[PDB]
């Protein structure tokens, strides 16, 4: 059912995450971490302290799909044992140095074809697939998350318990 998920998404903020590779999304799905560039790192830290939930919705460049969505459980943190991201051409480990802990809500794919009817008012009313770090307005982001199939590998309890 959607009661639990709708509870997690009440008053949530939503950010699109655009990964240049599949590897870092596979890594992040298993380990429960994400890192972004400093502009977006600042944006997500502000949203984390301000919002009841901060949702990252992931799409790998050129994949034609979203790969899942997750909720921040921490602000970014530097100084931990380093995540061995596959670094894109012009990116250093220092640029991805802040590590957010995330709890995945769905790790299943949603093709762009299934979200063609949703537009983001905060990106000029363009389809929500169009947009790293683009903020998605509350209702559009909620409906986008609701489109994903249920994920039998996920237990929402840990998220609901830490809210």
UniProtKB/Swiss-Prot annotation:
Keywords from the named record: Isopeptide bond, mRNA processing, mRNA splicing, Nucleus, Phosphoprotein, RNA-binding, Ubl conjugation
Domain YTH residues, every copy: 12-148
Effect of substituting residue 34 to A: Abolishes binding to N6-methyladenosine (m6A)-containing RNAs. Abolishes binding to m6A-containing mRNAs
Outcome, altering residue 19 to A: Does not affect ability to influence alternative splice site selection
Effect of residue 59 to A: Does not affect ability to influence alternative splice site selection
Modified residues (Phosphoserine): 81, 92
A single BP term in Gene Ontology: primary follicle stage
Cysteines paired by S-S bonds: none
Post-translational modification, as annotated: Tyrosine phosphorylated.
Keyword Transmembrane among record annotations: no
Compartments it resides in: Nucleus; Nucleus speckle
UniProt keyword annotation of Iron-sulfur present: no
GO molecular function, one term: RNA binding
Residues that coordinate or bind RNA: 18-20, 34-35, 85, 132
Subunit composition and interactions: Interacts with SRSF1. Interacts with SRSF2. Interacts with SRSF3. Interacts with SRSF7. Interacts with SRSF10. Interacts with CPSF6. Interacts with KHDRBS1/SAM68. Interacts with TRA2B. Interacts with KHDRBS3. Interacts with EMD. Interacts with RBMX. Interacts with ZCCHC8.
Domain commentary: The YTH domain mediates RNA-binding.
Chain's role: Regulator of alternative splicing that specifically recognizes and binds N6-methyladenosine (m6A)-containing RNAs. M6A is a modification present at internal sites of mRNAs and some non-coding RNAs and plays a role in the efficiency of mRNA splicing, processing and stability. Acts as a key regulator of exon-inclusion or exon-skipping during alternative splicing via interaction with mRNA splicing factors SRSF3 and SRSF10.
Name of the featured protein: YTH domain-containing protein 1
Species name: Homo sapiens (Human)
């Amino acid at each position: 059912g959607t009661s639990k998920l709708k509870y997690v998404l009440q008053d949530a903020r939503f950010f699109l995450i655009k990964s240049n590779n599949h590897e870092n999304v596979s890594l992040a799905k298993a380990k429960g971490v994400w890192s972004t560039l400093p502009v977006n790192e600042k944006k997500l830290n502000l949203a984390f302290r301000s919002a009841r939930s901060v949702i990252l919705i992931f799409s790998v460049r050129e994949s034609g799909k979203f790969q899942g969505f997750a909720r921040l459980s921490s602000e970014s943190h530097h100084g931990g044992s380093p995540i061995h991201w596959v670094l894109p051409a012009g990116m250093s480990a220092k640029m991805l140095g802040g590590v957010f802990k995330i709890d995945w809500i769905c790790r299943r794919e949603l093709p762009f074809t299934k979200s063609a009817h949703l537009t983001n008012p905060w990106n000029e009313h363009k389809p929500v697939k169009i947009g790293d770090g683009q903020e998605i307005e509350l209702e559009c982001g909620t409906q986008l998350c609701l489109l994903f199939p249920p994920d039998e590998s996920i237990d929402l309890y840990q998220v609901i318990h830490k809210m």
